[PDB]
Amino acid sequence: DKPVAHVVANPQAEGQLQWLNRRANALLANGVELRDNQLVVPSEGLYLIYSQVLFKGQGCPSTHVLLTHTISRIAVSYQTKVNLLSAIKSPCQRETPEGAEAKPWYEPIYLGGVFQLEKGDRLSAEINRPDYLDFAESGQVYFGIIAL
Amino acid sequence: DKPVAHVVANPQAEGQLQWLNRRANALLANGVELRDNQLVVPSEGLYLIYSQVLFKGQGCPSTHVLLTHTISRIAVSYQTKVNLLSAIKSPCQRETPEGAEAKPWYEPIYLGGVFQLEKGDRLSAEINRPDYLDFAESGQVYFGIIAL
Amino acid sequence: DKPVAHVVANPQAEGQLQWLNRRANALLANGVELRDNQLVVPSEGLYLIYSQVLFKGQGCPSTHVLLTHTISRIAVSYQTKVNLLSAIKSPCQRETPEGAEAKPWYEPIYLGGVFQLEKGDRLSAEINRPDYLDFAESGQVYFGIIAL
Amino acid sequence: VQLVESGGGLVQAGGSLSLSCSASGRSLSNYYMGWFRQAPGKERELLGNISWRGYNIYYKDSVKGRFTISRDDAKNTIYLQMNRLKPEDTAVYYCAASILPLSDDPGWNTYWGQGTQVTVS
Amino acid sequence: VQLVESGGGLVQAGGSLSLSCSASGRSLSNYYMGWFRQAPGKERELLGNISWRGYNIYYKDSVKGRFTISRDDAKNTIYLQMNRLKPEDTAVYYCAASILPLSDDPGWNTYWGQGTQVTVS
Amino acid sequence: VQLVESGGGLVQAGGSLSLSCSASGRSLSNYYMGWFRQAPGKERELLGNISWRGYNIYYKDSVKGRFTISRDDAKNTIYLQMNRLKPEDTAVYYCAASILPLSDDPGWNTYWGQGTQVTVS
């Protein structure tokens, strides 16, 4: 078999995005390691990288929220950190008026791509606002890689 | 030679999600079968699973619509059903057309991930509201798997 | 080893979607070619095709903007052009009302699927409104293929 | 979303029983509604679910062919028809609702009934 | 979205002809606009398309280098300039519009003109 | 978003220095805030970043264990604690902010401070 990962968000970690593999329907095998919340590349090659995040809020606040989700690469050879895949979502346009109840909103973000990676490279699936993350149910927030 | 699937929504099936493979740019090969609108896993292994759904509506109703899309696994060994990938979208954040006449909205949902599956497992691409689905044009609604 | 591509939007190209491979964390190898902004299939087989686009605007205009993103196939054997994957998004339900803050909005669109392609086929990742495209930061807009 | 079950009780083995669950709340058409059961000292299990207008239906293999799930969208009520009951069907039956398909790994976005006891033999 | 073609008729082989198509409706900037043709007893084929401000342009290989598609966004009009016409170009030419790129497999989200006959030789 | 650095100047090798960066603008909780440096003849490098409430923290390997980044969300200020100063730390230090994690390839969606010179020994 080949390098694999499909880590899921820890619903157990309050207000933060912590990756977890010690669960059913989750993977971390054939050299792939989860260190400091990052997936560590075991060998040089092409990898399919993917991640999904689900955001939720109850109405709209006065501040204009921008939700971001990115997969970053720490390339060990150059000691550089770059964003491989990134997406931005604006869940609100106007704050919920007083009296009018705060209806729930949901925003999914999916990232996926094929990248040539080096042994020892660290991938991070990062969000600017982890407090807006929804891990109420399994399958909503995940991060994975697979060697091709 | 690897087990594959890329089923598409039947445009002939009115207001319902019926998967179809007997079309150009659609796949169902190397053991993968489509029965009772689900994909049956032919052999044990890692599979890349993906699905897209496109929701459309003409304005906003009184009910607060929550559109959901999930890929569920019926694991035959344990006779258990779980959601592997899930996403939720709120098309109408209140914004009910009061006074004037409705304008069309569109909401795409994409799900994708790598999972270790067992022979005989049944995968379903489920939506809570099939009446909001849009298959007016090709490439808008699909569901697939590929063994890696 | 296998035919690969992961092309990114050219930040130098003003208000238009121009694919680029001559960048770090971008791919074009093992027969895959980029001709007239299209990816050329080098050999017959199954390919995972994917693309992401990020749209951004400042407030809402009077016109009901519909943002579309599609991956089309020009099949050289039949001299036919079809949409393999397509998605639509409506960013504005209501125009910014009277001297209001033109709050920035962001809309990501992701497309991905497995398709049997023929040698010489040309894939295009097309958007109806390139003037709404955001390539301010890396990883926001990409298009790729990988033979499986 | 609030769920209230009715219909449980004592039944002789080989017998029949039907359970009902009434839902109350906003936009119940968004929800999958279904049934779970849990016997004392035994694992919780999802028996099945039905979404709005019956578009999605699931039955756990062990109850397939003897248990039938139905939904009345005008009444916002689900029913569990149970035939040829056996001692192994003894459990507390729980009505559940979620905007996501119900699962054997339920999360915080699934609502629960009060539970109804079913005793066989 | 409503489309109305103009031009067409007859031209001698090796000759030239220009077709126009005027669009009417809301937010026409969202649409790809283009041309299809269908010859008697032959399958309908997409010749090409042009999106708002000419950002996307497609030409079917068989007409590339002789046919030119242009767009006037102030007038919401597209043009098809056809040079060195051959008897095989005899067909009814249709203007089409869709928020998605036009395709040889058009769906229910593509609008059509009335069609204009072009006879060569 | 406007960023203003403070601290820096001439410092003794082996010593300590703390740089501050104050941010002004709307919804600063959306931004990752961090530090870059550019030493004479050396490529501009990202030293690290910290998002709102310190949920994401990154340090470039070369400064890990001697440089500390902290954030005061009530003051919308980040701090760069630089210990055991070496002549190679002589550079212009720049505060940066972006809604995306900062990168060694920063784009048009990253805001910059005026830069602060740090001269060691």
Residue numbers in the entry:
A (entry chain C), B (entry chain B), C (entry chain A): 10 to 157
D (entry chain G), E (entry chain H), F (entry chain I): 2 to 122
Paper text:
VHH#1 is aligned almost parallel to the TNF surface (when comparing the orientations of their β-strands), and its CDR2 lines the TNF surface. VHH#1 and VHH#2 occupy the central area of the receptor binding site, while VHH#3 occupies the “bottom” of the receptor binding area. The shortest distances between the N-terminus of one VHH and the C-terminus of another VHH in the complexes involving VHH#1 and VHH#2 are 69 and 67 Å, respectively. Taking into account the orientations of these termini relative to each other and that a linker needs to avoid steric clashes with the TNF antigen, a minimum linker length of at least 20 amino acids is expected to be required for the VHH#1 bivalent construct, and 18 amino acids for the VHH#2 bivalent construct.
Tumor necrosis factor (TNF) is a pleiotropic cytokine with beneficial functions in immune regulation and host defense, but deleterious pro-inflammatory and cytotoxic functions during inflammation. To better understand and rationalize the activities of the three Nanobodies™, the crystal structures of the complexes of VHH#1, VHH#2, and VHH#3 with TNF were determined.
